[PDB]
């Protein structure tokens, strides 16, 4: 019933479009820098879609362009860098700490992809454009005047392994920050966006293909 297949995918397309609209709002700096707190967990995913999993926010700074490139055309979500502790594959190379004008993450790193690969916990710089979750969970991390630092590889493996203890304890997944109840995103367009997604979801399940 080809008319009915075309409707089903039309809905899915609309939900995909509204879903990237929604993600953009929550990545926008004016809506999230308040919650980019050292120790809060952050799910890092590249635009191409490689998933680095959850990591620990260590620092965040405003991005500065190169001397030869005054107007690099960054978006607001590409205009800030979060330093995140991530578990990289032991395979993965050396972590270059500064991103070039065209990179969202360093060039030579990848997530863990093989079992009996423990990984290596490294601090990695990421654009806000790669942020696909902020947790309600905060781990304790050393700071200035607390006498520790994330430069010590052994401290990185200590904090790193507690984050895997948190995820082990959260069987059903790490708990996300709610855009309304936790971040108090006031935008009227955003309010309509989440309702639009819900009513479309009700439309989509109404379709036979959902259970066919």
């Amino acid at each position: 019933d080809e008319a009915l297949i075309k409707d089903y995918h039309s809905i899915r397309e609309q939900i995909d479009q509204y879903t990237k609209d929604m993600v953009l709002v929550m990545q926008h700096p004016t809506n999230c820098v308040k919650y980019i707190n050292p120790g809060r967990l952050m799910h890092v995913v590249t635009s191409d879609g490689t998933d680095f999993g959850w990591g620990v926010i260590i620092n965040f700074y405003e991005r500065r362009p190169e001397r030869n490139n005054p107007n690099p055309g960054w978006s607001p979500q590409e205009s800030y860098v979060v330093e995140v502790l991530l578990r990289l594959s032991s395979d993965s190379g050396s972590v270059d700490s500064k991103l070039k004008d065209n990179q969202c993450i360093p060039a030579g790193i990848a997530p863990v992809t093989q079992k009996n690969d423990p990984g290596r916990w490294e601090v990695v710089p990421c654009l806000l454009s790669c942020m696909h979750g902020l947790s309600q969970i905060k781990l304790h991390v050393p700071d200035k005047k607390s006498g520790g630092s994330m430069d010590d590889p052994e401290t990185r493996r200590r904090v790193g392994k507690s984050l895997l203890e948190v995820q082990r304890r959260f069987e059903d997944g790490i708990p996300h920050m709610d855009p309304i109840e936790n971040m108090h995103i006031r935008d009227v367009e955003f309010k309509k966006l989440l309702r639009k997604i819900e009513v479309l979801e009700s439309r989509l399940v109404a379709n036979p293909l959902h259970n066919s």
Binding site: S162, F170, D172, P175, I197, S212
Partner: protein
Amino acid sequence: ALSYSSPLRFFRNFRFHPEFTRLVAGGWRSLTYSSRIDPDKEMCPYELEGTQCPSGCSFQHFVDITPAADERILLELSG
């Protein structure tokens, strides 16, 4: 049959989904949807290490965010 994961499944209102029991293994008692996490407290580093907190430890602990267990509560009510 065809399956799809809502982009709203990690947000608070997902608990009002009619199939919520079906798609989250833990149900309402799942820590993933606990209403008891203080987003500005830090989880206890001793607890996660598996070493015993000092007395009076005021980090956020898992017992703080885990719902009450109805078996303990049905227990207390009698007598």
